[PDB]
Amino acid sequence: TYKYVNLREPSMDMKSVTDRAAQTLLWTELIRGLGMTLSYLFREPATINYPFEKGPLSP
Amino acid sequence: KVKQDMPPVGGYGPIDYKRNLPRRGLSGYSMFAVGIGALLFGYWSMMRWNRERRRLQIEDFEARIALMP
Ligand SMILES: CCCCCCCCCCCCCCCCCC(=O)OC[C@H](COP(=O)(O)OCCN)OC(=O)CCCCCCCCCCCCCCCCC
Numbered sequence: 195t196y197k198y199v200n201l202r203e204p205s206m207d208m209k210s211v212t213d214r215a216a217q218t219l220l221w222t223e224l225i226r227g228l229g230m231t232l233s234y235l236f237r238e239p240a241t242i243n244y245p246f247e248k249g250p251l252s253p
Numbered sequence: 254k255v256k257q258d259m260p261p262v263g264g265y266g267p268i269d270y271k272r273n274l275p276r277r278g279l280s281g282y283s284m285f286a287v288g289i290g291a292l293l294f295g296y297w298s299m300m301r302w303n304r305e306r307r308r309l310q311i312e313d314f315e316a317r318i319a320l321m322p
Pocket residue numbers: 218219220221225289292
């Protein structure tokens with residue numbers, strides 16, 4: 195069935211547009227969301243040393 | 254014998270497909286309230302420190318002018 199996105203009413207009512215001037219102006223979503231979800235850095239990366247280690251295979 | 258094809262006891266437990274992107278509550282205008290607040294602190298303290306530095310300024314000019322003769 196059809197479940198569609200981006201068809202929504204952006205509220206020009208107050209308390210939405212507050213956070214819209216805050217949003218455009220202060221970059222909170224950009225900063226918090228992105229910079230933090232990269233600050234997700236600390237997870238142990240996945241890398242394998244090919245001479246000394248080898249990836250999985252199948253019979 | 255029996256058959257070794259895969260399917261286990263049914264269902265594999267539940268799975269969650271649907272989208273989730275929640276949780277930012279600090280944002281009313283009140284974000285402005287805390288930032289503008291921080292300004293309101295900065296101008297206070299900096300005001301004080303510039304006054305002090307003027308006091309020192311006069312004191313130094315007093316050193317010089319007492320020297321002049
Ligand atoms: C009480 C006495 C009076 C007090 C008065 C105080 C008033 C305070 C009011 C707010 C003050 C200003 C706040 C900051 C404004 C900076 C400029 C700005 O608003 O840029 C937003 C602008 C919007 O983009 P767009 O929508 O495309 O443009 C609209 C054009 N019609 O552009 C953007 O959003 C895009 C910019 C993206 C830049 C690249 C990404 C940068 C990511 C890192 C940013 C953070 C870095 C922080 C600093 C690091 C350490 C120094």
